[PDB]
Ligand binder design. Structure first.
Ligand SMILES: O=C(Cc1cc(Cl)cc2ccoc12)Nc1cncc2ccccc12
Ligand SMILES: O=C(Cc1cc(Cl)cc2ccoc12)Nc1cncc2ccccc12
Lengths: 304, 304
């Protein structure tokens, strides 16, 4: 029992973190096989970030200008290339600690763990989600760029995020490991305001199921609803529309608790309309939306 | 910017997790040097847990009855001893992955990361705190026993907790690495009700400072208070008394924000009396108490 914002064990990813320095800028790189991935803005100065021409700035750099350090030992850079917003630095040594891995591009609503790093050294691990506005609410300081987001399935690390920047609103933006930004963000110092940060409905429902499994049942009511009726309420409260695909994804949790998905929707509808009344659910006074149905089942089943 | 419930990177601890089986019971062990630490209840059956006599039950076990497996390889047990509520299994091989380590006994209000494990395999990492009633609000299932709590200072892991049991209230109890339980709990299936789970005042204040540092300042008011006046309010709300030692510990955060500790106390006093009014602080609708002043400074400074 108990339900926590749980991150994946970070060891496999710690073994991949390196320091990348170009000129006066130092950030983190991800070393997999004989390639080090890092944000392409490592080649920029502060004056460059206003309107950088990355192809032109990159022409002035050679392999020897990218200093890659793994622990206290230097890596030899034998090639460099830009793929979208990331640089791929080919080194002469394969990372001996390379885990089995994949590069995945996640959808909004999906969760992942972040290993926050500075100077190629891990500082902490936390769980977050790709928001519906394609930002992440992380915890990153200057130097955290190149820190990565990932999921683990037994022994395979699926990297899904690399940290690039913080928006003026304190929210974060980055790319997948092919260097494509999530959402409309660009790696430049410009006006980039985030869109509506809607609540991930299917995740709230999953977390309501996690609460029932852990004994918090006060919010269960005598009502039911329809997908269309629930969605009118969800629209009003800036919640993502619930689809039949989401209802299907909630099937195992519905089966475990014996609570029909639409009955849980009616409980959620009442919580939206009436509030919490000073009560809590799983130690929270707000409806948590950064646990997917898969995360709930995993945490509640002890998958290693 | 951003503030998350951040755990320490778990890699150093993952390299210490092993599986310990005795009879029909399988739980986790912590392998440091040539010793494997595990809860002594690994020697019990379900009928034993009602009123176990651990010395007597242990007499029936020999080194060969403790099956210790690190990954897929078996460890040879060459000695066994009981220290308080833990067993120390001497193996013939030093753990090659033993990090620099200490065994510490933490005080209530102190935070640590937990590496939840099953069958010697890590499933996740989360941050929690030693509650003032000596319980922890973890996330543990059957088989999680022997999972550990720790802090890291650069390269030294200070182990502070080993999971032993869940109370009927869904809260958790365990020992330090010398096998002494935190609080009054015992490793037996008996009536053990937890005391008042008071709120860790100094941690709430630290988290209010973290909110100011991250731009959430709506709760800042025009008031001040005294330690004695604040403590009358804290008493009413089941908050721990604030001492001059806590005020001193909050000095760096007070210096960083320019907000006197007693002024932050007055803001906290108003939040206790008036509530949040449907507003949030650092994405929370309740006052968070599982970040110490040290955790706030660390997260806000990027210590690796
Ligand atoms: O934002 C950056 C660096 C950066 C990257 C890019 Cl792609 C564009 C721009 C425009 C200005 O700075 C840019 N990095 C940081 C990441 N996360 C948190 C930060 C907290 C404080 C300071 C910097 C943080
Ligand atoms: O509680 C135990 C095992 C155990 C240990 C001790 Cl010292 C005393 C007793 C009395 C009955 O069982 C005992 N372990 C578990 C740990 N954490 C979470 C659990 C979730 C479900 C099931 C068991 C959980």
């Amino acid at each position: 029992s108990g339900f926590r914002k749980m991150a994946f064990p970070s060891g496999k990813v710690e073994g991949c973190m390196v320091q990348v320095t170009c000129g006066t800028t130092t950030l983190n790189g991800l070393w997999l096989d004989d390639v080090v991935y890092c944000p392409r803005h490592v080649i920029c100065t502060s004056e460059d970030m206003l309107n950088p021409n990355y192809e032109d700035l990159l022409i002035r750099k050679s392999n020897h200008n990218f200093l890659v350090q793994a622990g206290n030992v230097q890596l030899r850079v034998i090639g460099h290339s830009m793929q979208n917003c990331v640089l791929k630095l080919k080194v002469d040594t394969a990372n001996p600690k390379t885990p089995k891995y994949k590069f995945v591009r996640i959808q909004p609503g999906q969760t992942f763990s972040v290993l926050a790093c500075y100077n190629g050294s891990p500082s902490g691990v936390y769980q977050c989600a790709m928001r519906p506005n394609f930002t992440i609410k992380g915890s990153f300081l200057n130097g955290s760029c190149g820190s990565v987001g990932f999921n683990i399935d037994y022994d395979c690390v699926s990297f899904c995020y690399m940290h690039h920047m913080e928006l003026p609103t304190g929210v974060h933006a980055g790319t997948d490991l092919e260097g494509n930004f999530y959402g409309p963000f660009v790696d430049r110092q410009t006006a980039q305001a985030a869109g509506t940060d809607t609540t991930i409905t299917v995740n709230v429902l999953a977390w309501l199921y996690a609460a029932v499994i852990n004994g918090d049942r006060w919010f269960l009511n005598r009502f039911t609803t329809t997908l269309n009726d629930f969605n009118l309420v969800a629209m009003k409260y800036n919640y993502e529309p619930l689809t039949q695909d989401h209802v299907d994804i909630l099937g195992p949790l519905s089966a475990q608790t014996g609570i029909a998905v639409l009955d849980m929707c009616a409980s959620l509808k009442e919580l939206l309309q009436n509030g919490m009344n000073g009560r809590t659910i799983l130690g929270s006074a707000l409806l948590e939306d950064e646990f997917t149905p898969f995360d709930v089942v995993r945490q509640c089943s002890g998958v290693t």
